[PDB]
Write a protein that binds this ligand. Structure first.
Ligand SMILES: Cc1cc(C(=O)NCC[C@H](O)C(F)(F)F)on1
Lengths: 237, 300
């Protein structure tokens, strides 16, 4: 059934599994027309299909041409998400296929179940966790590859960089979700924190800065403050 | 006009014959039902006074044999049997009729209710859903499970309704996943109508039989089947016009006959709201929508 706070450690066991987040698949800007009506212009999007045990973010870039001449795009986006996830499970050799796919939004369940009928042994699960994966497009290197794409493309990022050399998957996922929740609540502040000090750099092959263990503790504390801060700025506490 | 004699009535029982019901007292000198209309299937059904658990009954067509009821004190139920000695049967029936020991099938001339509920129901198709080949009539009860229910346990006592499953490879063409799931026309028209049922008459027959088993026996799997067969049509954008018009008449008479007090258990809110208000056919079932809105406006 559903994945929640009670069964949180299941994410880090030795079944291969993928979180699928569809919140950035269909992206638009809303604007006025010359006649004063409103219209949308789609921009490139992405499916966020992440591996909890290694930090690998398997980003399928959704190019705006996939919407051309289509209707009911928010509904189609869920089916396109499911089609592309299914195509990834099939490309994979068998021992590498995930065992479970957890969707971050319940509206993805039926589309994914239908597309995965050929895989009756892969469990399709919802979650009660409010995961901040929508903020993935606040990671500069991910946003850049999505916006630059001229055609459909699959581009990967171990989203944990090299953290697993020093920390466990549980701790890596907790750091990732803290960083992303921060970026989601106040992207400017969050990014200031991450880049305030010009001596800590992001390696060319990484997404996040090369913080020491001690610096990560400082960073992580600042992100908690920012989140608590914004939670006061928001509710006046 | 045919007759189903009873050897006796040793236990107090509510007896149904089609949409009619009457009470018979323990050891009442009652010897059966006469004046049964020829040309339709019929159901004779039972609820014991001492144990309302297990409604049970028999589907039959008097054109296929001479049938009677006899209580079995070992198995504790009224059993239908066939009498092969036609002369014995005629002699028994004539005596019981002469002694006025029969209820008369109480059909009003104006009344087409039973025809309208069984228009497409054929005994030969009932006997393929309910498999007991040595008898010409078919036993059904409240507890019998369906083949689909059993896939999710005695196969010989199962209701072999056609399996309908909207999230199944049978229902969904590879490469048409969104199309087939959101518009079920290919599953309705190609897989089920052309492939399995052969024609809409057989589809409606099974739909009507499922409803009647739900209504008369409280058979939960039959109710599931009836709603699934409605939903499959309502969720298809392309349905022959004669089928939609006939479905509206079918459902109207089913809704008209349903006891007011059983609507809570026999009607699935999601299916009906979806079919009447959101589906492709939300504007194609005028008679059914009108009776539902006037008789069960709470459900909606
Ligand atoms: C009710 C219900 C009605 C009957 C029945 O057999 N009625 C026929 C006439 C009855 O034999 C007599 F009493 F008036 F003579 O059996 N159950």
């Amino acid at each position: 059934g559903a994945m929640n706070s009670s069964n949180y450690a299941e994410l880090f066991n030795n079944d291969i599994k993928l979180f699928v987040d569809d919140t950035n698949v269909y992206r638009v800007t809303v604007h006025k027309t010359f006649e004063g009506n409103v219209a949308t212009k789609a921009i490139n999007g992405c499916i966020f299909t992440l591996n909890p045990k290694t930090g690998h973010l398997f980003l399928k870039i959704i190019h705006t041409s996939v919407w051309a001449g289509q209707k009911r795009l928010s509904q189609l986006a869920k089916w396109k998400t499911a089609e592309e996830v299914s195509a990834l499970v099939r490309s994979l050799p068998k021992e590498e296929q995930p065992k479970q796919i957890i969707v971050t939004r319940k509206a993805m369940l039926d589309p994914l179940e239908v597309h995965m009928l050929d895989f009756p042994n892969i469990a399709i699960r919802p979650t009660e966790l409010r995961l901040p994966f929508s903020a993935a497009m606040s990671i500069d290197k991910l946003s850049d590859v999505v916006m630059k794409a001229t055609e459909p493309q699959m581009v990967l990022f171990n989203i944990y960089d090299d953290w697993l050399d020093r920390i466990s998957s549980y701790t890596a996922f907790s750091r990732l979700t803290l960083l992303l929740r921060a970026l989601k609540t106040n992207e400017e502040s969050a990014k200031m924190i991450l880049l305030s000090d010009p001596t800590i750099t992001i390696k060319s092959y990484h997404l996040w800065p090369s913080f020491t263990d001690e610096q990560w503790i400082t960073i992580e504390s600042q992100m908690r403050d920012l989140i608590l801060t914004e939670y006061g700025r928001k509710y006046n506490v | 006009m045919n007759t189903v004699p009873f050897t006796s009535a040793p236990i107090e029982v509510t007896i149904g014959i089609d949409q009619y019901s009457f009470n018979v007292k323990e050891n009442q000198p009652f010897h059966g039902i006469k004046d049964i209309p020829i040309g339709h299937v019929h159901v004779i059904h039972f609820q014991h006074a001492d144990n309302s658990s297990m409604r049970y009954g028999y589907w039959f067509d008097c054109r296929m044999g001479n049938f009677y009821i006899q209580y079995d004190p070992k198995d504790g139920l009224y059993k239908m049997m066939e009498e092969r000695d036609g002369a014995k049967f005629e002699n028994i029936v004539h005596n019981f009729k002469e002694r006025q020991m029969m209820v008369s099938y109480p059909k009003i001339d104006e009344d087409d209710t039973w025809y309208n509920l069984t228009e497409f129901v054929q005994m030969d198709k009932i006997r393929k859903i309910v498999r007991k080949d040595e008898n010409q009539f078919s036993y059904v009860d409240s507890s019998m499970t369906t083949v689909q229910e059993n896939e999710l346990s005695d196969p010989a006592h199962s209701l072999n309704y056609t399996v309908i499953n909207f999230k199944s490879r049978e229902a969904i063409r590879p490469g048409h996943e969104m199309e087939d799931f959101l518009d079920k026309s290919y599953y309705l028209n190609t897989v089920m109508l052309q492939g399995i049922f052969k024609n809409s008459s057989n589809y409606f027959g099974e739909l009507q039989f499922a409803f009647l088993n739900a209504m008369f026996f409280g058979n939960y799997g039959s109710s599931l089947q009836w709603h699934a067969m409605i939903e499959l049509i309502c969720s298809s954008a392309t349905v022959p016009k004669h089928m939609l018009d006939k479905l509206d008449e079918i459902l109207y008479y089913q809704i008209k006959t349903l006891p007011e007090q059983y609507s809570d258990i026999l009607l699935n809110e999601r299916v009906w709201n979806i079919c009447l208000y959101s589906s492709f056919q939300k504007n194609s079932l005028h008679n059914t929508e009108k009776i539902m809105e006037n008789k069960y406006p709470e459900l909606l």
